[PDB]
């Protein structure tokens, strides 16, 4: 999982150099992370998904800025759910 | 890299065995089923009128890609 | 219970594809009955409902959400109930096909929990769930990243039984 | 596109010259991204009536081509 | 238009009058239903489709939805007076 975090951080860091190859792949990974958070009822998986989402937010603001609303809505829905 | 030959689609044949208003015996469709053929609802404007309209619309759709072709429609 | 349900299933089988007419009459009552049933009748009712869905194929869409809700409510650690629900899942996916991807995420947590903890002898429940995942087909494209790591851990764990890891490898190969 | 769409409904379009499958190609992700970016402005275009800005897809692709050319001396 | 007329089997609100299709939860009571003692049954919604009867006069078959939840089917008579029928 840590290698995944480092890789996604590196890829998001490269989103400005080669947007054409990175932005679509990062959009797909964002979709996968979001559905993981929404559907997987596992603490470890959801925690890893949230960590990957945070790394993606930190490293690729430009890709996520159009998608700020759904990500925020999903995080809010997660917050309203009844692991630290 | 040279093009060996330039072929042209002179004519287009549009056979539409839609059979408006009658369901084929093989498939029993659901009550809603699928009613959009070439973005036209057959049941709204009557069987023959819908068949002709769908044929004309499909001819227009093909003309959108190949305007220069002879289009002859066969309806059932 | 068993008498009337067997009669209903036999009539639906005999009618063939014309049995769709009786869906509005039977489906809501059947779902309510399965909801309010108790004891060993539950698994038999789920099996007969699977047979009914197999007969009905694409016309079971309106009641599919309620069927999924019932399955989620009544899915427990019991081996027999899990097996019956897996068979019902296989019949559902072979009935619907493309549209099953809509209802798959609801069922995903139960499969994930089964993969996480399965004390069945030989992990036969896990093997049957692997077969169901094989039958899933193209509907798993939007959720492969979720189901795959459980199977990966399944066929990579040395402690897992050999037939279970063989089933996992076959499932991955088929999904490929 | 028809093959990609039909794959999601357990339908496999067939061509007389067998084409290798193309539903998994990464370019479809770029297609989806461009479609989403373009249609995100539609609520403002129809209701508010803003000026439709051009999609940066081609600019990004040319930037990627330039990046390739920067190191693409080798016959890779 | 004579050729077109038989094909006009049914009429949809979005074509003939989107104004009615817009109408929702009107305080206006269902016609011929108001009573000084009974509670007012105001119009809830109008069905999008009207099934025109294939007759010489081609009367429409309008169906309304009441606030009480009960449908009220009506026949839209055209080019004929109804005051006489009112007195009758």
Curated annotation (Swiss-Prot), chain A:
Modification after translation: Autophosphorylates when part of mTORC1 or mTORC2. Phosphorylation in the kinase domain modulates the interactions of MTOR with RPTOR and AKT1S1/PRAS40 and leads to increased intrinsic mTORC1 kinase activity.
Coiled coil: none
Tissue expression profile of the protein: Expressed in numerous tissues, with highest levels in testis.
Domain of life assignment: Eukaryota
HEAT repeats: 23-62
Location relative to the cell: Lysosome membrane; Endoplasmic reticulum membrane; Golgi apparatus membrane; Cell membrane
Function field: Serine/threonine protein kinase which is a central regulator of cellular metabolism, growth and survival in response to hormones, growth factors, nutrients, energy and stress signals. MTOR directly or indirectly regulates the phosphorylation of at least 800 proteins. Functions as part of 2 structurally and functionally distinct signaling complexes mTORC1 and mTORC2 (mTOR complex 1 and 2).
Associated clinical condition: Smith-Kingsmore syndrome: An autosomal dominant syndrome characterized by intellectual disability, macrocephaly, seizures, umbilical hernia, and facial dysmorphic features. Focal cortical dysplasia 2: A form of focal cortical dysplasia, a malformation of cortical development that results in medically refractory epilepsy in the pediatric population and in adults. FCORD2 is a severe form, with onset usually in childhood, characterized by disrupted cortical lamination and specific cytological abnormalities. It is classified in 2 subtypes: type IIA characterized by dysmorphic neurons and lack of balloon cells; type IIB with dysmorphic neurons and balloon cells.
Summary of subunit composition and partner proteins: Part of the mechanistic target of rapamycin complex 1 (mTORC1) which contains MTOR, MLST8 and RPTOR. The mTORC1 complex is a 1 Md obligate dimer of two stoichiometric heterotetramers with overall dimensions of 290 A x 210 A x 135 A. It has a rhomboid shape and a central cavity, the dimeric interfaces are formed by interlocking interactions between the two MTOR and the two RPTOR subunits.
Entry similarity comment: Belongs to the PI3/PI4-kinase family.
Record comment regarding domains: The kinase domain (PI3K/PI4K) is intrinsically active but has a highly restricted catalytic center. The FAT domain forms three discontinuous subdomains of alpha-helical TPR repeats plus a single subdomain of HEAT repeats. The four domains pack sequentially to form a C-shaped a-solenoid that clamps onto the kinase domain.
Protein name: Serine/threonine-protein kinase mTOR
Species of origin: Homo sapiens
Residues of the full protein shown: 705 to 792 of 2549
UniProtKB/Swiss-Prot annotation, chain B:
Post-translational modification: O-GlcNAcylated by OGT upon glucose sufficiency, promoting interaction with small GTPases Rag (RagA/RRAGA, RagB/RRAGB, RagC/RRAGC and/or RagD/RRAGD) and subsequent recruitment of mTORC1 to lysosomal membranes, leading to activation of the mTORC1 complex. Acetylation is decreased in response to fasting.
Modified residues (Phosphoserine): 74
Domain of life: Eukaryota
Subcellular location field: Lysosome membrane; Cytoplasm; Cytoplasmic granule
Coiled coil: none
Family designation: Belongs to the WD repeat RAPTOR family.
Protein name: Regulatory-associated protein of mTOR
Coverage span on the entire protein: 49 to 124 of 1335
